[PDB]
Amino acid sequence: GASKLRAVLEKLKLSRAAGMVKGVVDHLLLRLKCDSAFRGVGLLNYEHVKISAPNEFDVMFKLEVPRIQLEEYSNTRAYYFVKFKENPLSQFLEGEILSASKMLSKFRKIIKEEINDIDTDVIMKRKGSAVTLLISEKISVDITLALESKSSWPASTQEGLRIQNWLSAKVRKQLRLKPFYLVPKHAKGFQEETWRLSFSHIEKEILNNHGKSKTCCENKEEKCCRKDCLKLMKYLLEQLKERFKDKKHLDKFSSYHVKTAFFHVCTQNPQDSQWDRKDLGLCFDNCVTYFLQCLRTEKLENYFIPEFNLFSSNLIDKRSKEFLTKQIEYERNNEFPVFD
Amino acid sequence: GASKLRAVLEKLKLSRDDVKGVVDHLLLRLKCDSAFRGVGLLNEHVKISAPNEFDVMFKLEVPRIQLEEYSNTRAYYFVKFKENPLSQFLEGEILSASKMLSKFRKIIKEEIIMKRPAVTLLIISVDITLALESKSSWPASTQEGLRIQNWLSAKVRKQLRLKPFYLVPKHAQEETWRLSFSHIEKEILNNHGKSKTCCENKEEKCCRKDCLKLMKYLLEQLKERFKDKKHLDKFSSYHVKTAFFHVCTQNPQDSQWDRKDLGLCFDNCVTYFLQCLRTEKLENYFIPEFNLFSSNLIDKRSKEFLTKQIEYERNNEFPVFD
Ligand SMILES: O=C(O)c1ccc2c3c(ccc(C(=O)O)c13)C(=O)NC2=O
Ligand SMILES: O=C(O)c1ccc2c3c(ccc(C(=O)O)c13)C(=O)NC2=O
Ligand SMILES: [Zn+2]
Ligand SMILES: [Zn+2]
Numbered sequence: 141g142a143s144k145l146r147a148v149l150e151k152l153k154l155s156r157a158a159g160m161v162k163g164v165v166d167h168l169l170l171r172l173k174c175d176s177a178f179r180g181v182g183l184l185n186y187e188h189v190k191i192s193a194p195n196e197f198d199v200m201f202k203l204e205v206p207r208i209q210l211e212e213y214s215n216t217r218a219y220y221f222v223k224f225k226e227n228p229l230s231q232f233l234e235g236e237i238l239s240a241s242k243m244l245s246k247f248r249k250i251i252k253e254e255i256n257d258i259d260t261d262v263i264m265k266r267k268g269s270a271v272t273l274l275i276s277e278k279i280s281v282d283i284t285l286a287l288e289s290k291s292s293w294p295a296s297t298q299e300g301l302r303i304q305n306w307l308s309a310k311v312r313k314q315l316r317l318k319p320f321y322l323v324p325k326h327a328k329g330f331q332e333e334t335w336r337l338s339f340s341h342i343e344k345e346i347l348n349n350h351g352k353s354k355t356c357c358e359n360k361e362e363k364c365c366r367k368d369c370l371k372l373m374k375y376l377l378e379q380l381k382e383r384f385k386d387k388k389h390l391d392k393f394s395s396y397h398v399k400t401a402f403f404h405v406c407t408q409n410p411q412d413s414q415w416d417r418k419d420l421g422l423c424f425d426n427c428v429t430y431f432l433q434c435l436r437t438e439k440l441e442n443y444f445i446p447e448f449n450l451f452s453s454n455l456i457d458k459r460s461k462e463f464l465t466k467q468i469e470y471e472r473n474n475e476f477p478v479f480d
Numbered sequence: 481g482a483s484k485l486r487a488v489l490e491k492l493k494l495s496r497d498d499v500k501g502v503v504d505h506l507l508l509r510l511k512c513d514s515a516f517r518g519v520g521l522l523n524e525h526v527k528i529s530a531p532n533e534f535d536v537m538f539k540l541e542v543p544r545i546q547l548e549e550y551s552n553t554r555a556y557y558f559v560k561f562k563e564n565p566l567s568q569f570l571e572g573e574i575l576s577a578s579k580m581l582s583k584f585r586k587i588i589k590e591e592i593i594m595k596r597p598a599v600t601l602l603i604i605s606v607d608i609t610l611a612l613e614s615k616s617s618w619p620a621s622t623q624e625g626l627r628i629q630n631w632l633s634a635k636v637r638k639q640l641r642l643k644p645f646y647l648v649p650k651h652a653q654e655e656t657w658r659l660s661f662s663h664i665e666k667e668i669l670n671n672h673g674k675s676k677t678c679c680e681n682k683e684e685k686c687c688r689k690d691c692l693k694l695m696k697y698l699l700e701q702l703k704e705r706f707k708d709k710k711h712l713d714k715f716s717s718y719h720v721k722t723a724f725f726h727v728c729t730q731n732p733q734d735s736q737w738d739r740k741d742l743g744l745c746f747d748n749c750v751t752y753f754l755q756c757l758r759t760e761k762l763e764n765y766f767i768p769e770f771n772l773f774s775s776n777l778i779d780k781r782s783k784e785f786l787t788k789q790i791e792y793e794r795n796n797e798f799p800v801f802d
Contacts, residue, residue, distance in 0.1 A: 308676040353675055354633040 217296035240324035306410035482743035509591035577649035631732035
C-alpha cells in the first residue's frame with residue numbers, strides 16, 4: 141500500500157516565502173544586537189516544523205551565556221534554573237536566578253517596536269516557547285529565544301542519545317562536544333522561571349545525516365525511507381489535529397512528539413537494510429504502530445533526557461491519548477483517508 | 481604468511497604499551513611573544529618502528545592572507561597579507577619563512593636542547609613544525625582532490641573542506657609554504673570506513689589501519705637496512721600514507737577490508753605502491769597535479785631499487801618482518 145503514501149509524499153513535495161522572512165529576521169537581529177543584554181544574539185542554524193504548513197516558519201535565536209550554573213528544578217530532569225557588571229543579563233536577575241519572564245518581556249518588547257519600522261506590514265500575535273509574527277497577513281514566523289551553553293551536557297542526558305549501534309559511539313561523543321540550549325518553558329500554578337533543555341541542533345544533524353552508512357541516500361543502491369517515514373508521521377498528526385481542530389483533544393500533541401518516537405524507532409532499527417525504500421509501506425506501518433504503543437503505554441521518553449516522559453499523565457490527559465489512538469487506528473485500518 | 485603480519489602488528493603494540501607535556505610549557509612562554517600569540521597544538525610518530533620520536537604541529541592563525549602560487553608548484557605558495565603581529569617578518573609584500581623560523585628558532589632556545597620540521601628537542605625526541613593556519617577556503621589546486629565521495633560520502637567531503645588548511649615552511653625558492661592537511665589525514669584515518677560503526681564491533685572489523693602500519697613498517701625497515709646507501713633517503717612514511725589513501729579510494733567498501741583478508745589487503749597496498757614506483761606517478765591525495773614521485777623529485781634508479789627490494793620481500797614471505 142505504498143502507492144498512496146508516495147502519492148502523499150509527491151503532493152507534499154510540491155511545496156518547493158523565505159526572503160520576506162529572512163529580511164524580517166535579519167532586521168530583527170540588527171536591532172537586537174544593539175542591546176547590551178542581547179549583544180551576542182544570532183541565528184541558530186528558517187525551518188518548517190510543520191510539513192503541511194508552508195506559510196509557517198520557525199527560527200531559533202541563540203545567545204550564549206558563558207559559565208552558568210544550571211540548577212535542576214524538583215527532579216524534572218529537563219527543567220532547570222539558570223544561575224551565574226560582568227554579566228550583560230544583569231537587568232533580568234530575580235536574586236541569583238535568571239528571570240525567564242523579564243528576559244522574555246524585553247525580548248518581546250524590542251521586536252514589537254521593531255516590526256513597525258518596516259514597507260512590509262508585520263503583526264505580532266498575542267501571548268513562553270515566545271513571539272509569533274504575521275508577515276503580510278499570510279506567513280507566520282515563530283521566534284524562540286535559546287540560551288546557549290558551551291559547557292558539557294547535564295547529567296540527565298548521560299544515558300540519552302542512544303545512537304551507538306546506529307550512528308556509532310564516535311559520532312555520539314562528537315555531538316556531545318557541541319553546546320546545548322535552554323528555552324524558557326514553564327513547568328507544572330507553574331514555576332514561571334524555568335528553562336527546558338533543547339537539542340534542536342543535534343536533532344537536525346541526526347535527520348540530515350541519518351544512515352549507518354555514510355553514503356546512505358547518496359546512491360540508488362543505498363536509498364532509504366527514513367525521512368519519508370518521519371514526513372508521513374508528521375503529516376498524519378497535522379491532518380488529524382486540523383480535522384479535530386475544535387475538540388481540543390489533539391491540542392497538546394505536536395510534531396516533536398512524532399519526531400521523538402521516530403528517533404526511538406531509529407534506535408530499534410539501526411541497519412539501513414531495515415529502511416529500504418521498497419519497504420516504505422511496512423516501515424511506515426511500524427512507525428505508526430510504535431507511536432500507538434507510546435500512546436497506549438503513556439511512555440515516550442525524551443530522546444536526550446530519558447527520565448523525562450513526554451506522555452506522562454501529568455503532561456497529557458489519558459483521554460486525549462485515547463482519542464489520538466482511536467483516530468490513528470481508524471486511519472491505518474482504512475488506508476489513511478485523512479491524507480485525502 | 482598472513483600470520484607473519486599479525487605477529488608484526490602484535491610486536492608493534494607491545495612496542496608502544498609503555499611522553500611529555502614539555503610542549504605545553506613551550507606554548508606557555510611562546511604565546512607571550514607578540515608574533516606568536518595565536519600559537520597552539522594541532523592534534524604522533526612517523527617512525528612506527530621507533531616510538532622514541534614524536535612529531536607536533538604548532539598551529540598559528542594567519543587571518544587576512546592571499547595565496548599566490550609559485551610557478552605552478554600546486555603545493556608551494558608565497559604568503560602575502562591584505563597592527564600585523566608578523567610585521568617583523570615581511571620581506572617586502574611576502575612573508576619570510578626565514579625570519580619567522582629564525583625568531584621561532586630563537587625562543588625555542590631562549591625559553592628552553594634544540595637542534596636545527598624546524599627543531600628537535602632531546603629529552604626521547606619531538607619534531608616541532610611551525611604551521612600557518614588559514615580558515616579561508618582551500619586553494620584551487622585542491623579542487624579535484626580528496627576523492628572520498630564513493631567511500632566516506634560527498635557529504636563528509638564537504639564538511640572537511642570547511643575546516644581550515646595549513647601551510648608549513650618548505651623549500652621548493654626559499655620563502656615558499658607547502659600545503660598541509662595533516663589534520664584532515666588524521667580524521668580520514670581515525671574515521672575510515674563506509675559504515676560509521678566500522679571497527680566498533682566484531683561484525684565490522686576492517687584491517688585498513690594495520691595495512692598502513694605494515695606499509696610504514698616495511699619502508700622504515702628497508703630504509704634502515706640500506707641506510708649506508710642513498711637510494712631510499714627521500715622516501716618517507718608520507719609517501720606510504722598517500723598511496724594507502726588512493727588504495728582506499730580504489731576499494732571504498734568495508735567488505736574489501738575484512739580483517740580476515742589482511743594478507744590480501746596488504747598485498748593490494750604493496751602492489752599499488754609498486755605501480756606508483758614503476759610509472760613514477762604518486763599524486764598528493766589533496767593536490768592531484770602534485771606528483772610526489774616525479775623524476776624531478778626522486779631518481780628513477782632510486783625508485784627501481786625500492787621496487788626490486790620490495791619485490792624480493794613479497795616473494796620470500798617478507799623476511800624483513802623477522
Ligand atoms: O512542539 C512543541 O511544543 C515542542 C517543541 C520542542 C520540544 C518540545 C519538548 C516537549 C514538549 C513539546 C510540546 O509541548 O509539544 C515540545 C521537548 O522536550 N523538547 C523540545 O525540543
Ligand atoms: O615526510 C615528509 O617529509 C613529508 C611530510 C608531509 C608532507 C609531505 C609532502 C610531500 C613530500 C614529503 C616528503 O618529502 O617526504 C612530505 C606533502 O605534499 N604533504 C605533506 O603533508
Ligand atoms: Zn538514507
Ligand atoms: Zn575499520
